[PDB]
Design a protein around this ligand. Structure first.
Ligand SMILES: *O[C@H]1[C@@H](O)[C@H](n2cnc3c(=O)[nH]c(N)nc32)O[C@@H]1COP(=O)(O)OP(=O)(O)OP(=O)(O)O
Length: 517
């Protein structure tokens, strides 16, 4: 497999001290099936560039401790000396012995000296700076700064910088590691608030100070240990799920197809929406008055629900259904009974707003969207629900609120409407071999390899590296609609849950006859 974070890494930086050309590792043609043409870095590319500039490379120093990336003969056949310099492993910075070896080698060799590790930043910069200080009489400050400016923030491991300053300067003056650019983490695993409608007063929060704060407060309100969206995740009903409806009290509601959003009400104009991607949106003119003091405003409140699109003919009106509440005025309402929290919603959220809605002090035609609560019923009447618009049903246990995956919150969906959000990675291939049968692939969060594949189409290349919602039918994933509001695909566990559902489904009649008797 190609190394991580390599596709987005620049191939080369600017020459350092007029002598050293820092590089990421080349990848030979053996990796062409994993690397698109625009991202390829064969050794021939480096030699051809140098030839185009009438520049010779005297020596190439390989710091990767491996021969699996490319063929050294591709370098040596061009008259470039190749040396594989083994460096200390276990993540430690190069030893004094490694630096002496590097200096002894390089002082033998106007022509450039190429230096590369897997990515071309930490080992490469460490050795280059060591040479600059020991042999060219640079200050370590100047060496580190110059390498940072040549290959962007050249050394980003803090212990590397600390050791460089310990060897060549004052360790107490070692700089902290630089903040990393966004491209570093694009391969580790949405700007549109609501898809299809444009919504006033709602503007995404990218301000670095307040973004982390809103996310942090939501984490702490939910008791969420990991990173990411803290809200409860329902799982698709299968023939082994439905038996849970007999084992404890449950409430049902129709599921409109909508966009999950927690709403944090932290102050006066502090109203924020959070989607599954952890993206934050600031809402301006939504007012949440305190029940007891109608002049005062709510703080430390956390909600949960969907944003749905209602159609009042000729125009589509946004609506935000509140279908749970996590915290209220710092009171852990989420630990109370689901009926207690439904009443908390109704009596402490909808009612104080609806008092000032008949006083003229609150104008609903000023507000960004309509705020309602989702009705819940007993399963008994769910049967009648099977006898605004809903694409399925949701079954809520009456227990306390739980973040993360909830095996006991059941989404039932008619089997033909099951869908999964994939990250589309299109990889044009030869396939048959005479006719180039190109085939795109699909990805899920938390799984490194592809979850499955898809057939490449001309209409499909349109959304590439994007997110696509796919229905399953005819033993193939089928594109149905692009998803503009997700920067992230479904989790591997969510995708496997959907597959478990489709291969062991619950038909409408079966759910009907389970509920009835
Ligand atoms: O053949 C591999 C592999 O068998 C062996 N290896 C790596 N990790 C372990 C381990 O935790 N336990 C055992 N028993 N064996 C292990 O190492 C061989 C390859 O060595 P590498 O050079 O690839 O080690 P690497 O440089 O990748 O480590 P690092 O520099 O990324 O930290």
């Amino acid at each position: 497999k190609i190394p991580p974070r390599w596709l987005n890494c620049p191939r080369r930086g600017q020459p350092v001290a007029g002598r050293f050309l820092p590089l990421k590792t080349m990848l030979g043609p053996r990796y062409d099936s994993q690397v698109a043409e625009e991202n390829r870095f064969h050794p021939s590319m480096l030699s051809n560039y140098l030839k185009s500039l009438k520049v010779k490379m005297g020596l190439l120093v390989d710091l990767t401790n491996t021969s699996r990336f490319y063929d050294r003969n591709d370098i040596e056949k061009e008259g470039i000396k190749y040396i594989k310099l083994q460096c200390k492993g276990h993540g430690e910075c190069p030893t004094t012995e490694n630096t002496e070896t590097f200096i002894r080698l390089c002082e033998r060799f106007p022509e450039l000296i190429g230096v590369h590790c897997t990515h071309g930043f930490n080992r490469t910069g460490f050795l280059i700076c060591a040479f600059l200080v020991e042999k060219m009489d640079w200050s370590i400050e100047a060496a580190v700064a110059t390498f940072a400016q040549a290959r962007p923030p050249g050394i980003y491991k803090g212990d590397y910088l600390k050791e460089l300053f310990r060897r060549y300067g004052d360790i107490e003056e070692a700089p902290p590691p630089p903040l990393l650019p966004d491209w570093c983490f694009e391969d580790d695993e949405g700007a549109i608030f609501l898809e299809g409608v444009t919504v006033k007063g709602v503007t995404q929060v990218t301000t670095q100070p307040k973004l982390g704060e809103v996310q942090q407060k939501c984490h702490q309100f939910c008791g969420w240990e990991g990173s990411g969206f803290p809200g409860a995740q329902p799982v698709s009903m299968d023939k082994q799920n439905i038996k849970l409806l007999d084992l404890k009290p449950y409430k049902v509601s129709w599921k409109a197809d909508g966009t999950r959003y927690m709403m944090l009400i932290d102050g006066t104009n502090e109203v924020f929406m959070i989607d599954r991607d952890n993206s934050v949106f600031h809402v301006s003119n939504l007012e949440f008055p305190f029940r007891k003091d109608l002049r005062m405003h709510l703080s430390n409140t956390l909600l949960d629900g969907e944003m749905i699109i209602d159609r009042v003919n000729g125009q589509a009106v946004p609506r935000y259904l509140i279908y749970d509440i996590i915290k209220f005025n710092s009171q852990p309402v989420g630990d109370c009974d689901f009926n207690v929290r439904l009443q908390c919603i109704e009596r402490e959220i909808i009612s104080p707003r609806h008092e000032k809605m008949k006083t003229g002090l609150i104008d609903k035609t000023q507000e960004p969207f309509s705020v309602r609560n989702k009705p819940f019923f007993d399963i008994c009447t769910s049967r009648k629900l099977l006898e605004h618009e809903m694409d399925g049903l949701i079954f809520q246990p009456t227990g306390k609120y739980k973040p993360g995956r909830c095996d006991d919150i059941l989404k039932w969906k008619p089997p033909s409407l099951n869908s999964v959000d994939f990250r589309l990675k299109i990889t044009r291939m030869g396939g048959e071999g005479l006719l180039p049968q190109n085939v795109g692939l699909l990805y899920v969060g938390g799984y490194e390899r592809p979850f499955a594949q898809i057939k490449v189409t001309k209409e499909l290349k349109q959304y590439d590296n994007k997110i696509i919602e796919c229905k399953f039918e005819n033993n193939s994933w089928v594109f149905m609609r692009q998803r503009t509001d997700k920067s992230f695909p479904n989790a591997y566990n969510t995708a496997m849950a959907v597959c478990n559902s489709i291969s062991n489904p619950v038909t409408k009649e079966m759910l009907f006859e389970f509920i009835d008797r």
